[PDB]
Design a protein around this ligand. Sequence first.
Ligand code: NI
Lengths: 214, 225
Amino acid sequence: DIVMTQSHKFMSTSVGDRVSITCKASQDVSTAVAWYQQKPGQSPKLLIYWASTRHTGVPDRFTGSGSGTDYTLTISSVQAEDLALYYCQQHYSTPYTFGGGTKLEIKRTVAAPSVFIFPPSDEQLKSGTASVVCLLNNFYPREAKVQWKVDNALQSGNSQESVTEQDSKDSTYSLSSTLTLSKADYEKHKVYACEVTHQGLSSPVTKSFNRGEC
Amino acid sequence: QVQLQQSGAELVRPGVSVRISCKGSGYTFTDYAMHWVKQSHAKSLEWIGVISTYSGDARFNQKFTGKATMTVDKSSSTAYMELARLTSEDSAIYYCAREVRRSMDYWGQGTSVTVSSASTKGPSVFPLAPSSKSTSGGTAALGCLVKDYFPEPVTVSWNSGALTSGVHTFPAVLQSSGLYSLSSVVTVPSSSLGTQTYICNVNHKPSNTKVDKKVEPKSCHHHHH
Ligand code: NI
């Protein structure tokens, strides 16, 4: 079996800059290398076949280089929508093998989250559960501490976050943290608070409501 | 133009087998051999095998011999792969990609296979209502909570595909119950919170649940002066 080593799981680059993603083969696959782009929740799209040849609907800023063992996908003038995973692959001999992938991370200017907090809907409250949602919209960079406080008492072990991938237009991340509690435990407390720590904030930002009140 | 349309999300049981289809369209199907590739974990792409659509001759990744079986049916322009004796390490996303001269030039949307002994459950859907607590100047955030479903995936669209800008649909998380839960949000000019309707369309294919949920501003008790 032919090994296709992409040594970088992570490349970081800026809009307008040039990136080279490398891919090394364990032996001479003599030019029969393809590059694939996979954007968040999409299927791969072929970018380049036979090391240097560009497929259709493919912009001229993507080029392919390489002979024998070492291969290189170069993106001249990186664009915001170029966020994706990049995979090489040898089509030299079966079994066809792919590299381990390279995630292109795009650098952008700091941006602070807009923070929104959402109480449980009156109708989930009916079904027995209170799911409190806190939204961090459009921030950069990724690192973000979200802390829940219920009557100014710090919460632990009872929330869950998930984060989107960098947006194709503005390169920002977004996050939702959900505080899950039983309806009974929900209605013993007044103040529900979402406190957000992020580099683009002077000081932590707290979003909060008093239960049942505007 | 060119599209490969795959069979949808499958929820199957250990020890049984799945049949996945891949319909070629916009081109002459018999022109191009069809590949199948496995996407597991997060990133690991694996070549399973090729079937020549013109002859029916298939040849396999030795890692998949026995386990994978390929047939092609020229009249429906559809390629088939059968995965046998399923275990939880066959849970993955499987792609068909046509070969167009030593290159896999167009891929399908992928088929999500989930190997489980559980039944499907359809999601509950609840509004994430806009208010003063969700306004940051001209823009209001609103959304939908898609709770207590299995397996993946659910799809969420806003206003039946018409509201696309400012929409974030988050990765599902796994609750203690073993059931998935995700949120879909959209930020919206607040000028339009009365005049414009906001509806989220949740589609859970494996349970055949469609829900179209109206997101109104919540009941709310106002300060008293
Ligand atoms: Ni009153």
